[PDB]
Structure 1
Amino acid sequence: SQSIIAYTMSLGAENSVAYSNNSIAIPTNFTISVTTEILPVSMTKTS
């Protein structure tokens, strides 16, 4: 039961933030994040 709908863009959830002056977050766990970049170096050698 699909349809096409136009919407206002949210551009992502708003990250509601505020801060105190006596406490800072400090990491207990981390990850090794590996991603892939695909990049053009050369064009077909048209002659």
Structure 2
Amino acid sequence: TMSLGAENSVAYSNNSIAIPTNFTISVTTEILPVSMTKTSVDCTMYICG
């Protein structure tokens, strides 16, 4: 049976806050399709050669 992720109880209370004391600069890659090959078929030459 598949795991959905690690389980985590966030430390919530009516007067507690967490504040980050540092940071990390992250570089992420996203790849997107933009075009496909421009095919052409001559219908008469495909069908009748």
**CA distance in structure 2 between the partners assigned to 1:18 and 1:27 by the alignment:** 15
- Residue 18 of structure 1, CA deviation: 4.2
**Structure with a larger share of its residues in helix:** 2
Instruction: Return the index of the structure with the highest Cα Rg.
Output: 2
Q: What is the root-mean-square deviation of aligned Cα atoms in Å?
A: 1.2
SS in 1 for 2:6: coil
- Residue 9 of structure 1, CA deviation: 1.3
> Which runs of at least 4 in structure 1 moved beyond 4 Å after TM superposition?
none
**Structure with a larger share of its residues in strand:** 1
Number of residue pairs aligned between Structure 1 and Structure 2: 40
What are the ranges of 5 or more consecutive residues in structure 1 without an aligned counterpart?
A: 1-7
Calculate percent identity across the aligned residue pairs: 100
TM, length-normalised to structure 2: 0.67
What are the ranges of 5 or more consecutive residues in structure 2 without an aligned counterpart?
A: 41-49
- Residue 40 of structure 1, CA deviation: 0.2
